[PDB]
Amino acid sequence: NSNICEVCNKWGRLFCCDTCPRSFHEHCHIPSVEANKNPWSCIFCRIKTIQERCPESQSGHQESEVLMRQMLPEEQLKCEFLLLKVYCDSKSCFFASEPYYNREGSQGPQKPMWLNKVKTSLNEQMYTRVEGFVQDMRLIFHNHKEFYREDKFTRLGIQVQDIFEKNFRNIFAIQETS
Ligand SMILES: [Zn+2]
Ligand SMILES: [Zn+2]
Numbered sequence: 071n072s073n074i075c076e077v078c079n080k081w082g083r084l085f086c087c088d089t090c091p092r093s094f095h096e097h098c099h100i101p102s103v104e105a106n107k108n109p110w111s112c113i114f115c116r117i118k119t120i121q122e123r124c125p126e127s128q129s130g131h132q133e134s135e136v137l138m139r140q141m142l143p144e145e146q147l148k149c150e151f152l153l154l155k156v157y158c159d160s161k162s163c164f165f166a167s168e169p170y171y172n173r174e175g176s177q178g179p180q181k182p183m184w185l186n187k188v189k190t191s192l193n194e195q196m197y198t199r200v201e202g203f204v205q206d207m208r209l210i211f212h213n214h215k216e217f218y219r220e221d222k223f224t225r226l227g228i229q230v231q232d233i234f235e236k237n238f239r240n241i242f243a244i245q246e247t248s
């Protein structure tokens with residue numbers, strides 16, 4: 071197994087996947103690494119299993135059909151994996167904890183949002199459809215773009231949004247377009 075956490079790239083108390091060489095800190099893995107379970111399979115392995123069992127799950131989909139799906143166990147897992155993929159980028163640190171807004175010439179968003187809040191929400195089964203999760207995720211970047219205006223710091227939102235959107239298209243097999 072790897073000797074660093076797959077998400078944050080640090081050593082520490084690591085839990086090792088039994089079906090692939092990845093390791094994780096407890097609360098870096100999403101969901102949090104399970105108390106017992108021998109063998110244990112990580113979220114990457116579980117998502118690979120879904121694909122293997124239903125190879126047609128990788129044919130193209132329309133985003134609008136994906137958003138309306140109910141959060142059954144497989145969609146739940148997919149949103150967990152998408153969320154983990156954003157945390158894997160170091161630039162996620164800017165969006166993880168609860169923000170605050172006090173900048174001359176700007177006003178705070180009406181609805182603040184952050185990754186840790188989406189993580190709690192997923193854990194507490196508060197999203198009934200994929201749409202709920204995806205809306206909160208995009209809301210994080212949108213709020214950032216709006217607040218930081220022409221400051222070059224706006225680019226961080228564009229960057230992490232791009233990671234989110236590429237992973238969304240991949241995980242939910244969105245039909246490729248030009
Ligand atoms: Zn970690
Ligand atoms: Zn694994």
Ligand SMILES: [Zn+2]
Pocket residue numbers: 123124125126127
């Ligand atoms: Zn099938």
